[model samples]
Every structure is written in C-alpha cells, then in structure tokens.
Target chain A: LPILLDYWPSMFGMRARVALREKGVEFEYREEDFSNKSPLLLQSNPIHKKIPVLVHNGKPVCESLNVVQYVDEAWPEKNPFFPSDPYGRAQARFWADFVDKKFTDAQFKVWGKKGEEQEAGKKEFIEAVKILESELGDKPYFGGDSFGYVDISLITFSSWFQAYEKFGNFSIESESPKLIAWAKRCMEKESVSKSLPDSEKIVAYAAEYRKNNL
Target chain B: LPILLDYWPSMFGMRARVALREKGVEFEYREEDFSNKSPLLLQSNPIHKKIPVLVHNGKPVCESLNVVQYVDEAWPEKNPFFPSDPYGRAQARFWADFVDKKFTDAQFKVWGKKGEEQEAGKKEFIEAVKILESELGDKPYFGGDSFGYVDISLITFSSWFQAYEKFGNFSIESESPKLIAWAKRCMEKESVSKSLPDSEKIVAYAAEYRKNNL
Candidate 1:
C-alpha cells in the first residue's frame, strides 16, 4: 500500500488525497504536523521539504501535480481523471498549471495587503476571478460534467477562497458567480468535501498567521 | 500537418522544435516577431501571447515543456521521451518541472545592479545551478545516458547559457562544470546544434533588447 506523507488543510496535499479518492485507491494516510516536519517528508522531498509526498512500494514521488498524475497513471480504471483526447489532456494540464501558478497571487491580493496595496490586490483578484468565471462559464466543472483530475487539482483552493472572501470582506456571489457555483459543484463531491478544511477554521488559521507575520 | 509558431533561436521554441525533430514529425515553422505580435499567435495564446505554440491538426498547444509532452503523446512511437516505469516517470517529470520553474529566476540573476543585488542574484543563480548539478550528477543527460524529454526541454537553455557566460561575465566551467559539459554534449547532437544560435549573437540580441527597454 502507498503511504501518503501529508498535512491537513494544505491545498497541495488535498489535491493528492482527492485524486486517490477519485481513483478509489486504498492507501495509508500519514498526516504530518506543519510545525514539526516529518523525517519521512524530508527524506522523500529533501529539496523543498514540502508535503504531499507519495511513498509507494518504498519509492517516493514528490510534487503535488506530478503525484496526481502518478496516481492516475498507476490506476487508470478506478476513475479516469485526465482527458483521453490529446487536445483535452493539454487543456487539462494547462488549467492545472494556470491554477497552481496564479492562485497564490490571487490569494495574496486578498490577505497580504492594506490600503493602496489592498486595492491593487483587489483589482488583481477580481481580474483573475473574471477570467476564471469566463473560463468556467456554463461548465459544471473545470473538467466539464465530471470532476476530473484537473478539477480536483485546481479546486483544492476552494478552502482558501472561502477564508479569503470572508477575511477580505468580499463575496464571491456578486464578484464571481460562476466561480462561486463551481466551488459549490466541486464540494458536491464527497471526497473533495472530506479532504478540505472547513471555511471558518481556515479563516482562523489565516488570521493567526497574518497576525504573526504581517 | 502541424504548424509551429516560432522564432529562431528562442530557447522555448527550440524545446518544441527539437522534440519535433527527435520524433521525426514534419511541422511547418512560422517565425514570429515578438515586437510585432501576429494575430494568429495572439489568438492561439491570448493569456501570455507568447511562443512557441504547436498547432497540431488545427488545435494549438502552448508552453514549451507542455508542448514536448503533447508531441510525445501525439507521436509516442518515433521516440519515447517519457519513461515507462511509473516511479521513473514521476522522477523525470519532477526534474522537468524544477528546470521549468527555476529557469527564469536563475537566468535573470546575471542582469542585476552592480553591487549587492547583483551579488545576491549571482548567489541565487549558483543555488539553482547546484540543484541542477546534484540532479544531473554524473548522468550524461538529466534522465541519464539517453537523451530523454527532460534533457531536450532543458537543453533549450544551452545557447542562452553560453551567451550569459560571456555577456554576464559568468563562468559555467567554474560554477557548474558538470552542467557545462552536459550542455556541450546536448549541443553535439546534430538536431540540437542545427536548431540553436551561438552564444555571441544570442547575447547581443538580449543586450539590445535590454538596452532598449532599460
């Protein structure tokens, strides 16, 4: 059985968990405390020392997106996550990359600023949300009707968005209705909901972190 | 037939072009002027509006490393760029992602202000090089003796590094001897050498662009 070295409420770890659940792979989940980094985690990923390290048959596979792909390829039948068509596969990978690359900027804009910086962040966030809304338009999920690998990978940020929306005194309903709906649709999946942290708890954690750092 | 929107001597374009050549796939290459962006390039990749975009059978695949994977999946037989072992595949993908993610920051360090900033950039560049060096070790290529997908994807920087070594007053031999030798080996390939620009001309172009912008 593959042992997943992870931490709760980590968007990256959540992506891997959701992928495993979707694939119906039975694996051991070894949760690590963020304050105390696990030796296994370090051993598995020495360079970054990040979480979401999948140790399968003793061989470690690091990186969240890569792990998701690994799980999908290892067991293709449980639930086919990536698209079969080459074009669709490329698009799926593109969106996954886009979400991973840009989501941080969007989140920072919400929580990591004040006054002019805050306003600038607001503009950036709204602009990103607008693009996402347009991209998500009418599609039940970013992966279309089914919740595919890309959908799982990107929507792990639903928790962060929730807390950010509340902390920033913003609402997704008016700002990004499509994204809001997409979030709801994503949560509709039991695996996703189970793996994600509650909105209020995440907001509390973010508040504490910001108080200490900012 | 596939149409590649490309610019000769572009590192990213070289990645896609080399992959096509290695695969022995026939692709029509159309040069693009970055200063005067074409409508097709713009339409194909509106977000970044960058190249090279691989338009295969009418659909466009953007991003250099992503395009390599796309080409491999589209034509898997000619040359298998990706590994067969599941764990090996993940390892290959991680190195590729690392190379892709760190390239810009590492390369830009050479352009910093004369004092502390430049020194800091130099340090950062060396750090990145250290990581690459450790990853490569004694392997002839990133994925070992054989020229795998990651090797092709990363060797796109061979030309730019040569130019950077000269113009930036950096020394690949002194800093990363193994990396420099690996780069030389990559360039020795007929397909790779034919596609790359020599260091001086490439650096001159980058210098001109910097002079104009700064």
Candidate 2:
C-alpha cells in the first residue's frame, strides 16, 4: 500500500489525499505533527521536510502537486487527473501551477495576519480567487464537466474558506459566487469530502495558531 | 510555425529555446524589449506579461517549464525532455522544480548586488548548486546519460555563471567542479549552445541593470 506523510490542516496534504481517493487507490495516511516531526518525515523529504510526501514502495515523492501528478501517472487505469491531449494538459498544468503560485500564501495571510496586513492579504486572495472564478465560469468543473487536476488543486482550499472568512471579515461566497458554487459541487463528490478535513477544525486550528504565534 | 515571445539574456527563454532546438522543431523567436512591450506579447500572456511564452497554433503557453513540457509533448519523436518511467518523470519534475524554486533569485542576487548581500547570495547560490551537483553525481547528465528535463531546466543558468562569478567574486568551478564539468558537456550540444546567450553579454547587462535599478 502507498503511504502518505501528511498533517491534517494542510491544504497541500488534502490535495494528495483527494487525488488518491479520486483514483480509488488504497493508501496509508500517516499524520505528522509539525511541532514534533517524525523521523520518517525527515528521511522521506529531507529537502523540504514538509508534509504531503507520498511514499510508495519505499520511494518518496515530495511536493503535493507533484505527488498528485505522480498518483495520476502511477494509477493510469481510471480517473485521469490531467487531460489527454497535449494542449489540454498544458492548460491544466498552467492553471494548477497558477493556483499553487498565487493562491496559498495570499490566502494564508488573510488568516495569519491582522488589521492592514490582513486586509491586504484578503484583497490579494480575492483577486487570485476571482481569476480562478473566471477560469471556472459556467463549467461544471475546472476540467469542464469533469473533476481533475485544477479542481483537485483548488477544492482543498475550500475547506479553509470558513476560517479565512471569519478572520478576514469577508464572505468569499459574495466575492466569488461561481467559485463557491463550484466548490459546493466538488464537495458533493466522495473523493473530495472524505479526503478533506472539517472546515471548523481548520478554523479552530487557525485560531489556536494565531493566538500562539501572532 | 510556433512563435516564442522571448527576451534576450533570459534564462527562462533559453529553456524554451533549448527544448525546441533539442526536439528539432522550428520556431519564430520574437525578441521583446522590456521597456517597450509589444501588443502580441501582452495579448499572448495577459496574466503575467512575461517572456518565453510559447504560442502554438494560436494558443499561448506561459511559464518557462510548462512551455518546455509543452514542447516535449508536442514534439515527442526526438530528444524527450521527461523520462519514460513514472518514477523517473516524477524525480525529473521534482529536481527541475527545485532548480526553479531555489536557484533563480539567489543567482540574481549574486550578480545583482554587492558587499555583504552579494556574499550572502553567493553562499546561498553555492549551497543550492551543491545540492544539484550531488543530484548530478557521476552521471554525464542529470538524466544519467541523456540530457533531459532537469538538464534543460538548469543548463540555461550556465550563461549567467560568468556574471555571478565576476560580481560575487566567487568561483563556482572550485565549489562545484562536477556540476561545472557537466554544464560544459551540455554546452557541447548545438541545441544548448545556440539557444543560450554569451555569458559576457549577460554580465554586462547585469552590471547595467544594477547601475540603473540598484
């Protein structure tokens, strides 16, 4: 069985879990506490020493998106994360890369900051989300009537929306109705819901983290 | 023919150019002056407004590595950028990403700054290069024998090495001999040699850029 070195509140880890579930691959999920990282986590991903490291048959793959791509390639039988055609594949890679590049840190700032910094972060986060919204326009999914790479990449963040909204003092539903609706559609899938943690849990964790760190 | 929106002396542009040359594909390379941008360049890559955007059959592919992957997939007959196997492909993607994540800005800092900042940049740059050197090991190329994705992703940096060395006052040849040797081996290929700009030119540009900006 494949093993995932992961932590519960991580959007990155959620991406891999959702991908694995979508492919219907049975795997071991090893949760890592960031405060006390396991030896396996360190040995598995010495470079980043980060979670979402998928270890399969003694080989470790670091980086969440890369791990998701690895799973898609490894299990080529069903549920393709990427599109079949080269052009489609390039576009999928582009949007997913866009999400990775533009979304995460900006969104984190909304929850992890206060006052002016938090407001700025919320502005940036909404801008990034709106771009994704434009891409997701009228399509059932980012993959157009199918849930694939970009959907898998962005849906994991939906689990943190409540936390972000609470802290940032803004409603994403109002800001990006289409994107939020798409998130709801994606959440209906067993692959996504089962893999993602509860939004309340994420919110609580974020609050705790802010209290202690900030 | 495919059109490449390129800027001279850009390592990112060099990656796309090298990949196209390696695949034996002919492309129209449009040089972009940063000060005076073209409408086609802006229209092609509206999001980032960046160079090295590969316009294939009217579709624009932005991001350097993504463009390289598109080239590889489009022209699959010769000189494949990625490895055949899934694990190998994942590893190639990982290291190539590592190069993008760690190398670029650090190297720029080496040539784009002076005094303590340059020394610090040099230290960080050398550390990153050594990691890559260790990955290269005894292999003639990053892909063991063949020059592939990781090789293409990194070889463009060789053009800036002279600039980095001259400004930072450090010798990469002494720090990472094997990596430098491997770069020399890559330079022997027409695909790489023709695609990359002269190091001296890059150094002069760096000097001028520093004078104006810094």
Candidate 3:
C-alpha cells in the first residue's frame, strides 16, 4: 500500500489524491500538521519538506505534478491521465504547466492578501481563468471529452474558488462561466469529489488563515 | 521535418536542441532576435511569447522539457530521453525539474549580477550543483549508465559556467568537481557538442547584457 502525506487545505495535495483515486489505488492518507513537521515528510522530502509526498513501498515522490505523472505511469491498467498521442501529451503538459504557473500565483493573491494587493490578485485570477475558459471551450474537460491530466491539475483549485471569491469579492463565474460548468462536471466523478473537500470548508479555512496571517 | 524557434544564447533552447540531436532528429533552427519577434514564434507561443518552441508538422510544443519529451515520444525508434520503467521516469522528471528551478535562477545570479548579489548567487549555485553532484555519485549520468533527460537538462548550463565564473569570480569545479566531470562526459557526445554554444560566446553575450542593463 502507498501512503500519501498531505495537508487538507492544499490544492496541490488534492491533485495527488485525485490522481490516485482515478487509478483505483488505495493508500493511507496522512494529514500533515505543519506546526510540527512530521518525520516521514521531512525524511521523504528533506529538501522542500512540502506536502503531497507519495510514499509507495518506501520510495517517495515529491512535487504534485511529478506525483500525478508518476501515479499515471505506475498504474498502467488504470484510467489514463495523459492522451495516447505525443502531440496531445505535449499539449496537455503545456496547458497544465500554464495553470501551474498562472493560477497558483494569481489565486494566492485573490485569497492571501488584502485591499489593493488582493484586488490585483483578483484581476489576475479572472484574466487567467478566462484564458483557460477559452482553452476549455466546447470541450467536456481540459483533456477534451475525457477528464485527464489538465483536468487533474486545474480542478484542485475549484474547491478553493469559494474562498477566493469570498476574499477577493469577485465572482469567477462572471468571467469564466464555462470553466465553472466544467468544474461541476468534474465534481460528478467520485475521483474528483471524494478527493476534494467541500467549498465552504475551504472558505472557512482560508478565512481563518487570512485572519491569522494578515 | 521539424522546426525549432530559439534564441542562440538561451540555455533552455540548448536543452531542446541537444535532445533533438540525441535522437538523431534533423531540424531547421530559426534563431529568434527578441528586438523584433518572429511571427511564427509569436503565433506558436502566444501566451509566454517565449522560445525553444518545437514546431512539428503544424503543431507547436512550448517549454524546453515538454519539447524534449515530445521529441522523445515522436521519434520512438531512437535514443530515449526518459527511462522505460515508470519509477525511473518519475525520478528523471523530478531531477529535471530540480535543475529547471534551482539551476536557472542560481546560474542567472552567478552571471547576471555583480558584487554582493553575484557572490550570493555563486553561493547558491554551488550549493545546488553540489546537491546534484551527490545525486550523480557513482552513476555515469543522472540516470545510471546512460545519459538521459536529466543530463539533457543540466548539461546546457556547463557551457555557461565560464561566463558565470568570470562575473562571480568563483570556481564551480572546485566545489563540484564530479559535476564538471559529468559535464565533460556529456560534451564528448556529438549531441551535446553540436547543440551548446562555446563558453566564450556566452561570456561575451553576458558581458554585453550586464554592461547594457546593469
């Protein structure tokens, strides 16, 4: 059995969990309390000491995307995350990388900061998702007709959307309606829903986090 | 036939070039001068407007690693950039990402800045490479007994060392001797030699870049 070290509120951790669920792989889910770093996390990922460390039979894989890709490759018989063709694979990776770069930073600003900084973050977030919306246009998922790697990468943030909206005081749906619809479609899958926490729960957590940090 | 749009002096561009060469793929390399962006470059990678974009047939693959991986998949008959097994593939991706994140910034600091900033960058660069050198211990390359993706990723920087040394006034070989040796071994391969620019050319470019910007 594999063991996953993760934090409940982390969008990144959720990505790895969802990938495992999609593959029908059962694993021990260890919730990491960062106030005191766990030995397993520290030893497993000594360099970053970050969450979403997937330890399979003792060998550990770090980084959410790396973990996701690893799981896909490891479980060859499962629901494939990437497309079969090399071009599609490259395109999927390119878009996922785009989401990784743009969404993470923009969403952070939307929920993490306040006033002007938060507003700027909100603006950036809206711009990014709209771009993604165009990319996701007409397709059932980012992977087109199938929920795949790009879906796994972006859908982790949808649960956190409530929190971002609450903090930033903007509606993401107004800008990216199709993207929101796609999120709902993804939620219908147990692979996504079971792995992701409720939106209200995330909003509360983000509220408290901002209250404490800000 | 494939078309690669890249800037001559970019380490990222060199990585993709080397990967293509390693697979014995012939490509028309279009060197981009950023002062006036090429229409094809802009059209291919509109989001980032960046290069090392691998245009195969009509589709474009942006980002250096993605391009390399795409090349590997497209030309299945040749030398592979990734290992056959899933675990090894994950390991390769992780280290390649590590090189992507740590080395690019650290190496930039070493050659791009001056005085205290450059010295700090040099310190960070050595720390990063030493960590990589330890990982390379007893192995001929980043992957055991073969030059693979991680090698393709990191070897691009070896040629830039002279520029970094001249600006930062430090010896990377003294701190990471084995890394230097591995770089030499990589260079002996025609794939690496043909793709990477000479050290002095980079030094000259860096010197001019710093002179104009700093």
Candidate 4:
C-alpha cells in the first residue's frame, strides 16, 4: 500500500492528501509531529527531513508538488492533475509555482507579525491573490472547468484564510471575492473537503503557535 | 521562430538556452538589461517581470524549469529532459528543485558576504554541493548515462563556479571533486558547451557586480 508521511496543519501535506484523494488512491497516512519526528519520516526523506512525503512500494517521493505530479502520473486512469497539451501543462506548473513562491511567505507574515509588518503582509497577500483572481477570471477552476494542479495547490491554503483574517484583521472574501468563491466551489468536492482540516482547528493551532513561537 | 527573452549572465536563462540547443530548435535570443527593462520583457512576463521567458508562438512560458519541460514536449524527437517512468521523473523534479532552492541562495551568500557571514555561507554551500555529489554518485550523468533534467538544471551554474570560487576564496573542485568531474563530462556535450557563457566572463561580471552593488 502507498503511504504518506503527513502533517495535518501543513498546506504542503494537504496538497498530497487532496491529490491522492482525487486519484482515489488507497494509501496510509502517517502523521508527523515536527517537534519529535519519527525515524520513518527522517529515513523516508533524509535530504529534506520534512513531511508530505509519498512513499509508494518502499520508494519515497519528496516535495509536495513532486508528490502530486507523481500521483497523477502513477495513476493515469483517474483524474488528470496536469493538462495533456504542452503549453497547458506549462501554464499549470507556472501557476502552481506562483502559489508556492507567493502564498506561503505572505501568509506567514500576515499571521506571524503585528502592526506595520502585518499591514505590509496583508497588502502583499492581497496582491498575490489578485493575480490568482485575474488568472481564475470566470473559469470554474484554475484549470478551466476541472479541478486540477493549480486548484489542488491553492485550495490547501484556503483552510488558513479564516485564521489569516482573524490574525491579520482583513477579509480575503472582501478583497478577492472570486478567489474565495473558487475556494468554496473546490471545497464542495469530497477530495478537497475531506483532505482539509476544519478552519476553526487551523485558527486555534495558529493562535497557539503565535503564543508559543511567533 | 521561437523567441527567448533572456539576460546573458543568468543561470536560469542559460537553462532555457541549453534546453533549446539540446532540442536543436532555432530561436532568437533577445537579451534584457534588468536596470533598463524592455517593454517586450514586461509585456511577455507581466506576472514575474523576469528574464528567461520562453515565448513560443508569442505565448510566454515563464520559469526556466517549466520552459525546459515545454521545449522537450514541444519537440519530442530530440533529447528528452525528463525520464519516461513516473518515479524517475519525480526524482528528477526533486533534484532540480534541490538545485533551485539550495544552490542559488547558498552560492549568493558565499560570494556576497564577509567574515562570519561568508564562512557560514561557504559551509552551507559546500554542504549543499556534497548532497548533490552524493545524489550523483557512480553515475556517468545525474540521469545515469544520459545528460537530462538534473544535468540541464545544474550545468549552467558551472559557468559561474569560477566567480563563486574566487569571491568565496575556496575551491569547489577540492571540496566536491566528483561534481567538478561530472560538470566537465557534461561540458563535452556541444549543447551544454555552446549554451553556457565563458567562466572568465562570468568571473569578470561578478567582480563588477561586487564593486558596484556589494
């Protein structure tokens, strides 16, 4: 059976879970706690030593995007994460990477800072979301009518929107209504809905994290 | 003809040039000066406004790795940048990303800092290279007997090795001899050799950059 080295609160880990669910793949989810990591987690991902590793038949795939792509390729009969056309595939990869580069840092700054820094982070976060909104532009999904790579990539972060709004004191729904609507549409899919943790839980975790670490 | 919006000294841009050359595609290379950005560059890559935008039939494929994949798919008869198998392809993506994440900032720190900062940077740089060396163990190429994805992803940086070594006051050849040997082996390929800028020129450019910026 396939196994995933997972962390529930991680956006990256959520991507892997959603992709596997989308493919309807039967897999074992092994949760990891960052403070005291298991030897399996360390051995599986010696190089990165990070979670969201997809281990299939003893071989491990590191990195969330790589894991998602591997799931798509390994289970080709199921929901196709990437488009078949070269240009379309390239665009999917581009937008997914844009999310990788833009989203995480912005979210961190928003939730992890206060006052001027928090304000700056909120502005940056909004700008990034606006670009994604323009890209989404009327398409039901980022991949156009199908929930695919970019959707899987960006949707994992939506669970944190409530926490971001709470801590950052900004409504993402008010700023990027289309993007928020897209997230809701995606959450309606069982694949994404089941994979994501409750937003309230994420908010509570973030609060605790801010109290202890931030 | 395809157009590659590029800057001469960028390792990312060199990845695009090498991929195009490997595929034996004829293309126009429009060089950009970052200080005085062009309207074409801005228009082509409105999102990133970055160099190494591969414009095929006028649609821009931004990001070096994505561009390389696009070139491979767009012209399938030539060299294949990725492995055919899912696991191998995932591994290729992982290592290429390793290079993307680890090499750039570490190398910058090594060449751009002083005293304790420089020492820390050099140590980090060596550790990253050693991991790459371990990954490359016993293979004629990173892809094993073929110069493919990881090779294309990394070979461009070989040109800047001289600059890195000189500025950082250390020899990478001494630290990771196998990696240096592998780089030389890759340079034997006309595609790589023709595409990469001269090491001396890179050294000169780095020196000028250090004088002006650093």
For each candidate, what TM-score against the reference?
Answer: 0.93, 0.97, 0.97, 0.97
Residue-level lDDT tens digits of model 2 in B131-203: 8878766677774347888788999998988888788787889988888777888999997779899888888
Give DockQ for candidates 1 onward, in order.
Answer: 0.78, 0.88, 0.89, 0.91
lDDT of 3 by residue, A63-164 (tens): 899888887888788588777799999999999889888679989888888888877788788889888888886888775458798788888889988888
Best by DockQ: 4
Q: Candidate 4: what's its TM-score on chain B?
A: 0.95
TM-score between model 3 and native: 0.97
Candidate 2: docking tier: high
For model 1, what is the error of residue B123's alpha carbon versus the real structure, in angstroms, after optimal superposition? 2.5
Instruction: Summarize candidate 3's per-residue lDDT along B1-214 as a digit string, tens digits.
Output: 7999998899889989988888888889998888898999899887789988988979999999998889888987857667788788888888888999878888888877777877788888888978897776657887435678888888898888788777877777887667877888888998777889988899999899988996
Native-to-model Cα distance after best TM-score fit, residue A20 in candidate 2, in Å? 0.3
Please report, as a residue range, the 10-residue window in candidate 3 chain B with the lowest summed lDDT.
Answer: B136-145
Error of 3 at B114 (Å): 3.2
List residue ranges in candidate 4 displaced over 4 A: none
Interface RMSD of 3: 0.7
For residue B140, what is the lDDT in candidate 1?
82
Q: Candidates' lDDT values, in order?
A: 0.78, 0.85, 0.85, 0.85
lDDT of 1: 0.78
Clashing pairs in 1: none
Off by over 4 Å in 3: none
